Each structure stands twice: as C-alpha cells, then as structure tokens.
Design a protein around this nucleic acid. Structure first.
Ligand SMILES: Nc1ncnc2c1ncn2[C@@H]1O[C@H](CSCC[C@H](N)C(=O)O)[C@@H](O)[C@H]1O
Lengths: 239, 321
RNA sequence: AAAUGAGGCGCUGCAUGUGGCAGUCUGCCUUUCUUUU
C-alpha cells in the first residue's frame, strides 16, 4: 500500500540506463554530498554513483524488505568483478559472490562505490519540535516519486513536516531537485485503507501550489526554476 | 477416437511412471514396489495421482489401456500391475547424459519441454522446481536425454543450454569464490575487532493499557512509555489492541497514571492498574511465560545472514563517523 | 506509465517473561523440504 514494487530491477551494469538520469544535468553532482529519498531497488541511485562522482550519497526508504535487496544490488556490482558468464539460477538461490565493502579505518573514500550507504528509517517524526531540532549536512537532495505516497499517507501535515525537514537538512548554497507527481490519477487508488481515502479528501494543497508553498517562508526556499512530468530546481540561498 | 486417445495417454503416463529414470529419482513408487509381493501395486492407488485424476477414474479403461503396453504387465484381474522388467541399479552415465537449461518463460509444462525437446532427442525425464508450494515455475529445467550424443547434438542445436558437468563445475567455482570473499571479510572483521528465578513480586507495578484503536508496533510503545518513566517490560503481541507494561516502582505506576495529557488526549487509551487477583494471575502468567521462554530451544540463524547483518552495522557506524 | 524472498536442517556457551550476544569452513545444504508422487 506504499505502491512499492520489486520489479524493474537493474541487473545491468550501469551503461544501459532507466532514462530518468538521461534528463539530469551533470554540473551539480561532482563531489557533493547527496541525500536521496525513496529509492527502493537502488538502481537509479547506483547509476548516479557510478557515472558521476558524489563524495557521499545516501538513499533512504522505509521498507526493511526493500533496503536488504538494495544492499544485494550493491553486492552485485562488486560481484561484477574461458571467462564465466554464471548460471542465473545459481546466483538467485545462493546470493551474490562478493562481500560488502566495509572500509578500513585508514581508508580512502570517494571511489565507486565506497561512498554509498542505505540507511533505514521513517522520514517524518510527526513533531514540529523535532523538525526544529535538525542540522544541515548535505548539498544535493534528490527526491523523485515521494510526494504521492507521503501526500496520501500523511495528509498535508506530514508533507509540511517533510518540506520543513528537508529545508532543515540543506546546507546554504545547497540544491534540492524534484520531479513531483501531477494531480492526474491521485484518486485511482484511495481504498488501500479507509485512512488513505480520509486523507485523499483532506488534501488542502495542490501540485500547482507546491512551488508556491516551497517559496512560502514557513519552508522558505530562495529561488527556483524549471529546466526540462515536471522537472524542478529549488535552491537554498548562498551561504 | 477420443477414447483411444485417452488409452494412449494412460499408457504413456504409466510407462513413464514405470520408466527407468523416474523410478531412479522418485522415492515413493519404489517403496510401493518394494513393500509388495513380487513388485505390485493397485491400479486405484495410481488413480489417486494428480495427473491421473485429470484423465480417468475408471480402472477398467486403464486395464484396457495397458493391453498394448511395452513395459507393464498386469496380473490376472486387471487391478494390479507389475514393472514387466525388474529394476536394476542406478546408472552413472545419466549425469553425463543430462542437459541444464535456464530462462523459461513462466509457462512451464512437461509437455512444453517435450514439445521443444522431442525433436532432437527422446526425452526421458524432466525436473522442474516450484516455488515453495505456491505453484510457480522458477525459470529453469533439468532435461534427461539418452546415450550422450543426443544431448551433445541438442546443446549444439541451442534459452541458455549447457551441460550438467559444466553446471556442476560452475557451481564449484562459484562457491569457492564466495568462500574466498567471505574469508577476506571475516579477516576484515577480525582486524577491526583487534583494533578496537526471573523477575520478583512488587505490588501495583503492572499497567494494563486497553485501546479501542488497533495498536502500532511495540518498539513505538516501548519508546512511548519509556520516555516518561522506567519500563521493565512492554507486553504486546503484534495486532492486539490491549497490552501491558511492568514498571519498576509503584512511583513509576503512579506517575504514568497521572500522565493524563500525553497519553489519554493524544490517543484514546485506558491506562489503568490491575488489582485484585488480576494482578495475582498476571504474576502467574509472567512466571509461566518465563518458564516457557527458558525451556524454549534456540532459534536458527544462518551464517551469511548474521554476517551480512554485522557487516552492514559496521559499515553504517564506520561511514557515519 | 499498478503485487516474491533468506527457502531447509543444525552444533556449541554467555545471557534470558529483558526483546539475545559471541562462535561453529560463508555452520553446512539449496534441482530438493518438494506430487509429473
Ligand atoms: N515516510 C517515509 N520514510 C521513508 N521512506 C518512505 C516514506 N514514505 C515512502 N517512502 C519510500 O519511498 C518510496 C517511493 S516508491 C519509488 C521507488 C523507486 N522509483 C524505485 O524504482 O525503486 C516507497 O517505496 C517508500 O518505500
């Protein structure tokens, strides 16, 4: 009822791609700390981590059964290294070859993929006093296809805490990029609970009013633009 | 005729079930042979099979279906059947004769495998794996061809298709490389490690909390009652709307029942103290659950799951600092 | 621009109504706990 699917998994080493990252522009991503939400199979995450170079990139999801599989997906690109092609059935039941790359204490980071790490947790703590307690530690925050489920599951109120919390996690000069869902088919699935329908009719902000509310000083973003579902750049101010 | 077609199907399925390969794989029909006088079994026992129930429950038509039969003989009445030729030893050349094939299109039938593989050889046995009695094919097959050169013709004919010997050597190499990587990571964990009567009776300490709402997870409840004052136990099976907590002191109990604001106004919860013999029976339930937990045998945990758990926790703690 | 993985069996000894911990060759095995009986 989060709408998450294990399908469309990337077995492929990241030359051939999904195509969302074909749209994205390379300039921000070089050597910058990235927090990225809502990436269950991690295939879009890892493909960013290979082709461009961020220093630290952290994906975050809620389902424990999805983050275990995303750690299997990072183990497959380490198990990437008459040569053998390997029977597909053998890997499925045994698990992939390599170990997880735990670094040394005297270790060098910023090498694929010693950077990336998948942590598990709900994002919204449901308290604005806990929203106020946060500190900035990132430069580029990426969030695709999260507005829909957080909207329908936590009303407007948890979405407002999520916007306020991601403004509390940006360092100044930091960039948030978003490709949110249009209002199009929100109704199509309201009966997963009764609470999901009770929040779908409790919607007090529209996706056209997303870009207004991010410029509203309860969140307080500095300047925003759209260079291409929509493609949006929101900026916290410099320093 | 359709009756003749059903007779041919019965003769086909029974002659496979008295075929050499399928008898050298299956335990059960061999035990039906061996627990018998000269190797016999009732026909109605074979009627109970799942593919046999898809055809015929009439044993008379089945005894007519084995009148033209190559490797079945019937005794007198047409109610018991023999293997015609007695079962010898299991051959070892069938390992060489086999063919492994991956990538099946999730429509797996034995007849589908015979339809694709009868053209190049005489198909003798099929192994197909179902996902834990949920009736789903996994996507790969084990085909038994006969006398080597049919299978070596068929591998040349093509849906990855490779030999069982190649598959077994590939399995040996794969487990050797996984054992090498886990050996190196166990060395890494060794190196970083080298771098660095049960509960007794107090009166009035037990708080029963009933809810009308179905309760969330017990970690949230443990954090909720623990953030106010001292929890010894949060008792909640996942899905119950009524729960308990055991506290350290009656002062802890008196403090939490006087937490009217953050408990009762945030959530419709009845937080009360058990007294009377409710408390006495609840201490009995606590002692019984203690003896049940202590007499419980130990849970099982595999090596790669415990190691991947510990490895991810150390990668989390080393990455965050 | 809508739903499958730790699947099977352990052996230790510290702790244990307390939510396990440290080992066991990655604890072994995986076509397979398996009905095409
Ligand atoms: N409150 C929350 N906290 C953390 N993760 C959440 C969350 N709400 C939703 N999510 C995660 O965000 C995900 C968005 S679904 C998008 C998945 C991605 N497109 C892919 O291909 O894998 C959901 O699966 C859900 O697991």
């Amino acid at each position: 009822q989060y709408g998450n699917y294990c399908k469309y998994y990337g077995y492929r080493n990241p030359s051939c791609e999904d195509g969302r990252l074909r749209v994205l522009k390379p300039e921000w991503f070089r050597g910058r700390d990235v927090l990225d939400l809502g990436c269950n199979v991690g295939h879009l995450t890892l493909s960013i981590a290979c082709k461009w170079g961020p220093s630290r990139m952290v994906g975050l999801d809620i389902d424990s059964r999805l983050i275990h599989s995303a750690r299997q997906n990072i183990r497959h690109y380490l198990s990437e290294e008459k040569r053998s092609c390997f029977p597909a059935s053998l890997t499925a039941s045994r698990g992939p070859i390599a170990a997880p790359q735990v670094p040394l204490d005297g270790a060098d980071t910023s090498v694929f993929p010693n950077n990336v790490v998948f942590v598990t947790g709900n994002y919204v703590l449901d308290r604005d006093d806990l929203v106020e307690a946060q500190t900035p530690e990132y430069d580029v925050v990426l969030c695709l296809s999260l507005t829909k489920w957080v909207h329908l599951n936590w009303g407007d109120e948890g979405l407002k805490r999520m916007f306020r919390r991601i403004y509390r996690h940006l360092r100044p000069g930091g960039i948030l990029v978003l490709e949110p869902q249009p209002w199009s088919s929100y109704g199509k699935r309201k009966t997963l609970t009764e609470t999901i329908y009770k929040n779908y009719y409790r919607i007090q902000l529209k996706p056209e009013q997303f870009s207004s509310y991010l410029t509203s000083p309860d969140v307080g973003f500095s300047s925003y633009e759209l260079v291409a579902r929509p493609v949006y750049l929101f900026h916290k101010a410099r320093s | 005729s359709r009756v003749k077609q059903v007779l041919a199907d019965i003769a086909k399925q029974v002659d496979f079930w008295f075929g050499d390969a399928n008898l050298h794989k299956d335990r059960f029909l061999r035990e039906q042979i061996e627990k018998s006088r000269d190797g016999y079994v009732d026909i109605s026992l074979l009627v109970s099979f799942n593919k046999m129930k898809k055809l015929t429950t009439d044993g008379k038509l089945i005894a007519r279906a084995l009148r033209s039969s190559a490797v079945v003989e019937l005794d007198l009445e047409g109610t018991r059947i023999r293997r015609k030729k007695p079962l010898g030893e299991r051959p070892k050349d069938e390992d060489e004769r086999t063919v492994y094939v991956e990538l099946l299109p999730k429509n797996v039938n034995h007849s589908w495998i015979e339809r694709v593989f009868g053209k190049c050889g005489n198909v003798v046995y099929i192994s197909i794996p179902h996902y834990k009695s949920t009736g789903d094919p996994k996507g790969f097959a084990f085909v038994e061809f006969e006398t080597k050169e049919q299978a070596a013709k068929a591998i040349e004919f093509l849906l990855r298709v490779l030999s069982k010997s190649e598959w077994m050597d590939l399995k040996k190499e794969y487990l050797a490389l996984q054992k090498a990587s886990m050996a190196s990571l166990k060395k890494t964990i060794s190196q970083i490690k080298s771098e660095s009567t049960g509960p007794q009776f107090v009166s009035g300490v037990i708080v029963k909390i009933i809810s009308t709402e179905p309760l969330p997870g017990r970690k949230q409840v443990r954090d909720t009652l623990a953030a106010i004052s001292e929890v010894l136990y949060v008792d909640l099976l996942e899905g119950d709307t009524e729960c308990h907590a055991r506290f350290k002191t009656p002062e802890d109990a008196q403090a939490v029942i006087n937490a009217y604001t953050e408990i009762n106004k945030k959530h419709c919860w009845k937080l009360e103290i058990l007294s009377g013999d409710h408390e006495q029976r609840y201490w009995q339930k606590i002692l019984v659950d203690r003896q049940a937990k202590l007499n419980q045998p130990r849970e099982k945990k595999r090596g790669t799951e415990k190691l991947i758990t510990k490895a991810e926790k150390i990668r989390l703690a080393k990455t965050q600092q």
